[PDB]
Design a protein around this ligand. Structure first.
Ligand code: NAJ
Ligand code: NAJ
Ligand code: PFB
Ligand code: PFB
Ligand code: ZN
Ligand code: ZN
Ligand code: ZN
Ligand code: ZN
Lengths: 374, 374
């Protein structure tokens, strides 16, 4: 048995910013109390993982990144009650401790045990389970899914349906749930409304899915890469616009197209300028804009607060506003009942060993989601 | 009779910025089609009127300001159906045309016929009803209440209870309704919640009234003028804090006081810094912050969008989110039914001829609302 023992396995270690991942052997300690060690089956490449590489997102290095994944429990530490060895699970990059003021709140999901706001790159106990070349390696968001085995705190894992296809449902661990929830839960898109979605990657496509599910009459996709438009229309966009085609700023174009502003807009890119543009293009009196994209570290946007005084609502969210541990199993169940589709987001499949090629595909603009198989 | 004739009367004309009002004779044309001429009875001094004087707000000059008032209809133009001569009325600085997309929207109140966004300083027809010393004088927000008589568009006036005390209910024309609605309608303050209110003038006090009416457990008033604290506690503040008393930024103080951030915060001053502070002090995952204050013309704030990404909601409003013509008569009816109090807001009552003294009282920090009586 491997239970109670250090596992040697391959992981994708990021030693330095702006460098390829190094696929090499790591040592994965056994789980301590209220920890779970997971044999990974599939992990998606989310733009936020790339942000770690580019320095857009600052987290301590060296690191094992990865946060969108699914696997099978190898072993559980003392006191674990919510998963067992052999269970299929999705790591939760937003934990759900169930005890903090946010977890107890009907609408909050950004559990105070998160490692996002001020990343330490550790387990909840402030230590690491990973060694590489004899050196400690940081965790990422308590998940570190770019490894054949990871160890996560119990509050950062959800048991999912035993019959789930892990190579699909890993997307519920970040990109699908985030985009879909941003529309259906956070914005609360209404039937007959007009939506504008900035950024047509995996997350933006999932926003469109949610807007369509909510009954939006018009869903305007916005991207500077027109190659993204065909898939956006397939999943529900009624029109697509490329800001580069227009002389005027796209907020003006979108205001004109929507006869005075859209009902709901979404920033699904990660740029300060598009966050302000997305706000501006919603109707000034009753529009709602949701920020989903991750901004470059420590940078402030500039905006005129008259955009809000007139009546706009501006909000953001992590993980689509979903309470993670409650929601992930339900989302999987709904997927299994064909309530939504994940295949439109999956454009490439690669073995884990080809992780760098998977990032190249994202960076070139060619992929939506590449799923890596272990 | 005056009907159908030019009225010569007294008004407070602002000829240029940063100068006293000139109290002198103006000529007031009779109302054209769909216009209403009102004999003013009482008008309040709102900080937004002072913003015109100070240049914080830009609107065409020379101007007859004033927007918080009540009076009695002197005459109506052809086609007016909603008021008649002799009716008590409140001018509506936010109109309610009933036809535009905002008026038709269940939540929106910032009617597209407003003269706030891009002020012209005219009637709806692009002309003025005021002359002074042979010169045309601009209107202000379609109301211009600093005059013994004004002319307003029908969409900018509401009929109110004939038994209403006009020297109190004029506050429903701006400051009471704005603050109360910002809490009860826009923020939707919840029972048992913790609120922070920045600025304890007439509008901030009305926010406190609304937070208390909504059942907030804690209502923390914030002002740099500690003389404002006693009245804030009278109307429901459970604690008051002066940022000047602390070595740390007040957002940190308020986060600590509320064991991790407030449920609802309100900016009721008009400063960019306090807008960002008020946002920051609400709980990062589920907090709501509402901007009520009017900041200086054309200035942008700077903020880190991570404040929103974690889950905060940021909104603003004009006139407390109330659809003006529907809401004003109901608010007056509620006042007459003793559902809320207005006396706590009224610190001074002066003749109209003392308008400048009234503004000096506001600027010195001594008054909440001065009511000017004609
Ligand atoms: N809030 C959350 O919980 C959460 C979850 C997942 C992803 N994210 C972030 O969401 C963003 C999108 O992630 P993704 O879908 O994986 O990324 P992606 O696949 O890189 O998609 C981004 C899209 O934005 C497009 N784009 C780039 N610049 C512009 C521009 N100026 N105007 C219009 N379109 C432009 C780009 O062409 C691409 O199709 C990233 O910033 C992620 O870090 C946030
Ligand atoms: N959104 C609307 O529809 C609407 C309606 C009415 C008023 N307003 C605006 O709301 C604001 C308040 O109006 P009001 O109540 O008549 O004004 P006011 O009576 O001057 O009250 C403002 C209060 O803010 C206090 N203050 C000033 N600087 C600070 C600071 N740094 N920190 C904390 N407190 C501070 C000040 O001492 C005073 O008590 C003004 O900007 C108005 O223009 C907006
Ligand atoms: O893609 C999800 C995601 C986020 F939304 C973040 F805000 C973040 F910091 C991060 F590391 C992450 F992975
Ligand atoms: O006090 C109400 C009020 C406002 F909220 C404004 F935004 C404004 F421009 C103005 F002139 C005004 F009077
Ligand atoms: Zn929690
Ligand atoms: Zn992600
Ligand atoms: Zn209207
Ligand atoms: Zn006012």
């Amino acid at each position: 048995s491997t239970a109670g023992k250090v596992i040697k396995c391959k992981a994708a270690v990021l030693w330095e910013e702006k460098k390829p991942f190094s696929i090499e052997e790591v040592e994965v300690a056994p789980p301590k109390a209220h920890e779970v060690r997971i044999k990974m089956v599939a992990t998606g490449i989310c733009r936020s993982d790339d942000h770690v590489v580019s320095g857009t997102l600052v987290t301590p290095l060296p690191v094992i990144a990865g946060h969108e994944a699914a696997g099978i429990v190898e072993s559980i530490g003392e006191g674990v009650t919510t998963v067992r060895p052999g269970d299929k699970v999705i790591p939760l990059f937003t934990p759900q401790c169930g005890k903090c003021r946010v977890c107890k709140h009907p609408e909050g999901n950004f559990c105070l045990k998160n490692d996002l706001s001020m990343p330490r790159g550790t387990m909840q106990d402030g230590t690491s389970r990973f060694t590489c070349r004899g050196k400690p390696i940081h965790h990422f968001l308590g998940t570190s899914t770019f490894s054949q085995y990871t160890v996560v705190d119990e509050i950062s894992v959800a048991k999912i349906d035993a019959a789930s296809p892990l190579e699909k449902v890993c997307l519920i661990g970040c990109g699908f749930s985030t985009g879909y929830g941003s529309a259906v839960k956070v914005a609360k898109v209404t039937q007959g409304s007009t939506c504008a979605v900035f950024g047509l990657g995996g997350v933006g496509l999932s926003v469109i899915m949610g807007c369509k599910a909510a009954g939006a009459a018009r869903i305007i996709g916005v991207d500077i890469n027109k190659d993204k438009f065909a898939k956006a229309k397939e999943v529900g966009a009624t029109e697509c616009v490329n800001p580069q085609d227009y002389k005027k700023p796209i907020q003006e174009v979108l205001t004109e197209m929507s006869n005075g502003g859209v009902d709901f807009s979404f920033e699904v890119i990660g740029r300060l300028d598009t966050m302000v543009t997305a706000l501006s293009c919603c109707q000034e009196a009753y529009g709602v804009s949701v920020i989903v994209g991750v901004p470059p570290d420590s940078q402030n946007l500039s905006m005129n607060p008259m955009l809000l005084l007139s009546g706009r609502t501006w909000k953001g969210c992590i993980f689509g506003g979903f309470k993670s541990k409650d929601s992930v199993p339900k989302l999987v169940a709904d997927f299994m009942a064909k309530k939504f589709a994940l295949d439109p987001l999956i454009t490439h499949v690669l073995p884990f060993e080809k992780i760098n090629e998977g990032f190249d595909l994202l960076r070139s603009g060619e992929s939506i989601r590449t799923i890596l198989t272990f």
